[PDB]
């Protein structure tokens, strides 16, 4: 769900950046309410995420080549030998059905090599399950002697916004998703709107990203009146302030001049102490899934020489307790923890 | 719990396991942010599960978090509340902050739960209101007095401390003494509470409590205040805008 | 390089370029800082353990 | 009651008390050798 920015420099159109949207316009409230948002952590609305807000997909392609001059491995299935329920993922040709759900261990293709006289399969292995988007057979680098050995398989990995994923405004204010807060528990505006994204007010005094503050009242003014605003640098002056410009626009529309909104608590239901700073800010979802190195080991495999847990997250590997952690355990005088 | 680089033994402390349903990440309280030098910017932490009682006793009595309130570098605190809680406290302990019987009792039970062993009297004791007539009203500072009254032992007398604030008296108007933090027999009678009181700052209220009642009580006070200000920020929010 | 402008009202292009200089200057120092406390601590801890 | 307990690893604690805060002095000068280079000397 790509969206055109309300607040934008006119050069955005000059480069036709609308052909490739990089973000989405979100209702962002500068509020400290949940308690889970603080400095490097921001809150995303549950009901917004449920409605497809900031949803993304990731495509991965694999080349299955049979080269390792006489042809031995052939795409498909060998006669007389057939291990149980493989036909569920692959078609008669040995290639997978485009659209099929696959998990690590499932067969991604099938072949038969005469050297071993057995029907073997190339397994799919990744922590993230996928769906087959594209299967292309390529039989090149030959004049008359044609036979397929090379196949390109594209995987579609669906990526919903998860707790840990980074989100940022166009002002360098990045934060990890601390929680997907429910709309009933979310603070609700006088208008009846609950913010899509919650940014903590304690982020701004150190970063000094006032561009985001003027972007908030500009985006709101442009959403109401239905007009895009120019946010090209040095357009405004000390005499002609944007806070006054969009402030006048906000007052004319029927909202507070200083970009504030009377909001009510989602828990108590009572009106909050003061009017909360709410607006429309163009947010970007960063491609990284930070919890990729998430692991747990009780008793897994060990190396023959040291007889110590082997290295490898996916291999049920061990966490290293290095010299510094050794030093720290000596530090506490905690000899049994070291042991 | 370990956050690399382990530059000092406070970066490897003993935590009490709390299994939280429908979770995919390790949840950590803001008071631990300092010691680990960990910022929630996509940081990673190692969890070690010792497999014997001698190793258990050590992680609960020697390397445990509560016994790491003060760093051995300067003997100063490395434990305290960090952002929302500091802004919440300046508002909650302000003279202008008043509360009805219904509001007051809610803020008390919101942070102090006898069933979770937060109390020391097995019954939530409550102070009388500061305003009797016309309407019964409790001051914000009285909530801080009540939290201490229920977390500090009944056998020991109340805390006596004359501290200062980061916020000068000039900001609170004419003739205010709101900079002077005053605790007489465990009762906040003057001054608001800053980063200088329940933050990782020496000779504040939490540190003063740590010296008189011990590390376990100071830890209870930190968790209790941490909940109170989270609940207070939920009922009474805090925002920043162009007007500021 | 004296900037009379503020972040609320905005900063002039000359001031913007000068702010870019001083802003980057700090990040350059974080890139060129060979001094590390790793080995210094490792040498003390092994002799004082 | 403020006495250091027999068994306390004052050695590691000392090196950690010199090491950990010497990370805060990784930045350059704003004549004599300062920070980590002087500490290394």
């Amino acid at each position: 769900t790509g969206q055109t920015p309300i607040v934008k420099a006119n050069l955005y159109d000059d480069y036709g950046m609308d052909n490739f949207p990089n973000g989405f316009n979100a209702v962002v409230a500068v509020i400290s309410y949940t308690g889970y948002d603080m400095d490097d952590a921001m809150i995303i609305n549950k009901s917004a995420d449920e409605r497809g807000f900031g949803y993304g997909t990731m495509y991965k392609t694999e080349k299955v080549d049979l080269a390792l001059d006489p042809i031995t491995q052939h795409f498909g299935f060998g006669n007389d030998e057939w291990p149980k329920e493989w036909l569920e993922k692959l078609d008669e040709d040995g290639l997978p059905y485009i659209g099929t759900y696959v998990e690590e261990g499932d067969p991604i293709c099938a072949y038969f090599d005469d050297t071993l006289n057995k029907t073997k399969i190339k397994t799919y292995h990744s922590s993230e399950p996928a769906y087959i988007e594209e299967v292309n057979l390529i039989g090149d680098e030959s004049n008359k002697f044609q036979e397929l050995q090379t196949v390109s398989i594209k995987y579609r990995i669906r990526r919903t916004p998860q707790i840990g994923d980074k989100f940022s405004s166009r002002h360098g204010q990045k934060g990890v998703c601390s929680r997907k807060w429910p709309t009933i528990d979310m603070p609700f505006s006088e208008t009846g709107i609950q913010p899509d994204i919650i940014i903590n007010p304690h982020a701004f005094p150190s970063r000094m990203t006032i561009g985001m503050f003027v972007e908030s009242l500009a985006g709101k003014a442009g959403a109401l009146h239905g007009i895009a605003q120019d946010s090209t640098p040095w357009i405004f002056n000390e005499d002609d302030t944007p806070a006054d410009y969009f402030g006048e626009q906000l007052a004319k529309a029927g909202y507070n001049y200083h970009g504030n909104e009377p909001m009510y608590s989602g828990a108590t239901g009572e009106e909050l102490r003061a009017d909360i700073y709410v607006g429309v800010v163009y947010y970007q979802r960063l491609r990284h899934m930070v919890n990729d190195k998430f692991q747990v080991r009780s008793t897994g495999p060990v190396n023959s020489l040291t007889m110590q847990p082997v290295k490898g997250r996916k291999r049920h590997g061990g966490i290293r307790v290095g010299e510094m952690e050794r030093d720290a355990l000596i530090g506490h005088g905690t000899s049994f923890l070291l042991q | 719990m370990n956050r690399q680089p382990t530059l000092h033994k406070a970066s490897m402390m003993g935590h009490k396991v709390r299994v939280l349903p429908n979770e995919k990440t390790l949840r950590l309280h803001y008071a631990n942010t300092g010691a680990y030098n960990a910022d929630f910017d996509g940081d990673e932490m190692n969890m070690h599960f010792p497999q014997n009682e001698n190793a258990r006793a050590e992680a609960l009595n020697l390397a445990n978090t509560d016994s790491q309130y003060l760093t051995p570098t300067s003997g100063s605190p490395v434990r305290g509340l960090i952002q929302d809680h500091i802004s919440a406290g300046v508002w909650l302990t302000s003279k202008d902050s008043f509360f009805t019987r219904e509001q007051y009792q809610q803020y008390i039970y919101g942070c102090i739960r006898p069933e979770d062993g937060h109390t020391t009297r097995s019954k939530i004791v409550t102070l009388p209101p500061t305003i009797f007539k016309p309407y019964p009203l409790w001051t914000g500072k009285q909530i801080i007095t009540t939290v201490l009254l229920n977390v500090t032992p009944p056998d020991m007398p109340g805390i006596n401390l004359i501290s200062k604030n980061k916020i000068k008296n000039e900001y609170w108007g004419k003739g205010s003494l709101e900079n002077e933090v005053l605790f007489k027999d465990g009762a906040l009678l003057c001054g608001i509470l800053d980063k200088s009181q329940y933050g990782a700052s020496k000779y504040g209220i939490v540190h003063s409590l740590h010296e008189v009642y011990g590390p376990e009580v100071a830890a209870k006070v930190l968790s209790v205040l941490g909940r109170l200000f989270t609940n207070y920020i939920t009922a009474t929010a805090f925002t920043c805008g162009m007007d500021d | 390089g004296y900037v009379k402008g503020r972040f609320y009202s905005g900063i002039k292009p000359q001031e913007y370029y000068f702010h870019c200089m001083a802003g980057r200057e700090g990040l350059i120092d974080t890139a060129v800082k060979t001094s590390r406390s790793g080995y210094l601590q490792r040498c003390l801890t092994k002799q004082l353990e | 009651r403020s006495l250091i307990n027999p068994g306390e690893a004052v050695g590691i604690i000392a090196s950690q008390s010199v090491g950990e805060p010497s990370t805060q002095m990784t930045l350059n000068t704003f004549n004599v050798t300062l920070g980590i280079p002087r500490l290394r000397e």
Partner: peptide
């Protein structure tokens, strides 16, 4: 660069490969 440090579980205390190695390049 910090993403690689975010996943790696350090063997020890950083490394002296900088000025420290050239200071150690002095025989007694």
């Amino acid at each position: 660069e910090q993403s690689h440090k975010k996943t790696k579980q350090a063997v020890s205390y950083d490394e002296p490969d900088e000025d420290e190695i050239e200071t150690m390049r002095e025989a007694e």
